[PDB]
Amino acid sequence: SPLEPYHIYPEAKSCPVAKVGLWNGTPAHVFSGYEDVRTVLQDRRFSSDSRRPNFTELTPTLQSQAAAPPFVRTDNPDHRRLRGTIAREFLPKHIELLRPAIREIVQGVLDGLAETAPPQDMLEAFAVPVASATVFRLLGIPAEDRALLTRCVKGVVSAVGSEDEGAEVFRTLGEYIGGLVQDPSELPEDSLIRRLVTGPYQEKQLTFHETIGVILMLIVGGYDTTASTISLSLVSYALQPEKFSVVHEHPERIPLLVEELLRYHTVSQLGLGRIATEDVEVGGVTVRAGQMVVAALPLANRDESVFPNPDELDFDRPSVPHVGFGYGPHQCVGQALARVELQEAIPAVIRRLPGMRLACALEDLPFRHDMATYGIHELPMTW
Ligand code: HEM
Ligand SMILES: CN1C(=O)[C@H](Cc2c[nH]c3cccc([N+](=O)[O-])c23)N(C)C(=O)[C@@H]1Cc1ccccc1
Secondary structure, three states: OOOOHHHOOHHHHOOOEEEEEOOOOOEEEEEOOHHHHHHHHHOOOEEOOOOOOOOOOOOHHHHOOOOOOOHHHOOOOHHHHHHHOOHHHHOHHHHHOOHHHHHHHHHHHHHHHOOOOOOEEHHHHHHHHHHHHHHHHHHOOOOOOHHHHHHHHHHHOEOOOOHHHHHHHHHHHHHHHHHHHHOHHHOOOOOHHHHHHHHHHOOOOOOHHHHHHHHHHHHHHHHHHHHHHHHHHHHHHHHOHHHHHHHHHOHHHHHHHHHHHHHHOOOOOOOEEEEEOOOEEEOOEEEOOOOEEEEOHHHHOOOOOOOOOOOOOOOOOOOOOOOOOOOOOOOOOOHHHHHHHHHHHHHHHHHHOOOOEEOOOHHHOOEOOOEOOOOEOOOEEEO
16 A cells, blocks of 8 residues: 555564665664654664764665765754754744745635646645745745756655766755855845855854755755645545545644644655664664664554554544654754644645545556655646
């Protein structure tokens, strides 16, 4: 099954800590249990620092960056410093101020769609425009430039790309973004890029290339992870629309419902890698210093012991805390924004198009088995 994540690390079907080779052959202990995963991810002995001997990104494309990564591949003091430059933008209190804008962006797209004859690729026609417009508004990216940024993001996220292909992607992406860093003048005043450039960059809290790091990561997490999550939520809707009764009868439960989609559809499908900095016992296993590990989110999000009937999409759970956004210091800084988008986007589209069914067979859809984050390359829906 394409909607069940047990194919990624088949070894974990058999054991809660499972030894496996990564793309380049490096072995890595895969943690599949929720507590173990939570443990790995706030332990100081597991590091996101890619410059360390033996660090192995989960795809070759990302490997290409290890020697000079964005902040997602840093430890303190740098992590605190870099994340610090923009953390304040994504405080739930500030992101809430975007809700009506977001809600407008959504109504915008649904207004388009309402006149269009089905079927439609709801990725291209609903999820991506919502998601991308939202973060591009926040960032201040020119409209002109979004098709390109879109293309290049698919590059970064490829799990089939090579290390030399990935270098070029990032090179190209980086040169674009460097262009805005060096000339912020064409960007809106209420733009996150501009605040970052004229503020902490000019104040030299970070370098030119660190700045590009920051922005690049908001461009990537800002819409690809969000636009897929939307997409798959629709797939679940298409398959089981009377589970979504709630949207109509229980609006105050939408927030839960979103969480439950975050759990079920853990798009960070390969989990998160970490390197041990000294020997550490977790989940009854000693991890020798310098060993890679993988925190398998989507399986931790299906760990029956914490989530009864995990393979069932179930909006009647009392609030339960998925590690969809990860955990620890590197936990998704954009999580607040994506919650909002999903809260606004998914209800909207169900209400305006509740006969949304799949315009072709589940087994025919092109699921992203070749991407570092999951989802679908196209989602033909009729209604
Ligand atoms: C469904 C939506 C999203 C999912 C599932 C997602 C998932 C994640 C995960 C798992 C990480 C952990 C990386 C690690 O620990 O090694 C992460 C980090 C990050 N996410 Fe997201 N995210 C989403 C949305 C966003 C959005 C909307 C933004 C920005 C607008 C964003 C920006 C980031 C950044 C900058 C990081 C790096 C955190 C750090 O190293 O300090 N994410 N995200
Ligand atoms: C969960 N996840 C990832 O592990 C990776 C990130 C990454 C892991 N190692 C990286 C090395 C360089 C650049 C990036 N980058 O900019 O996304 C990376 N990507 C790309 C992803 O789409 C997702 C979501 C995400 C995007 C941006 C920053 C954090 C998370």
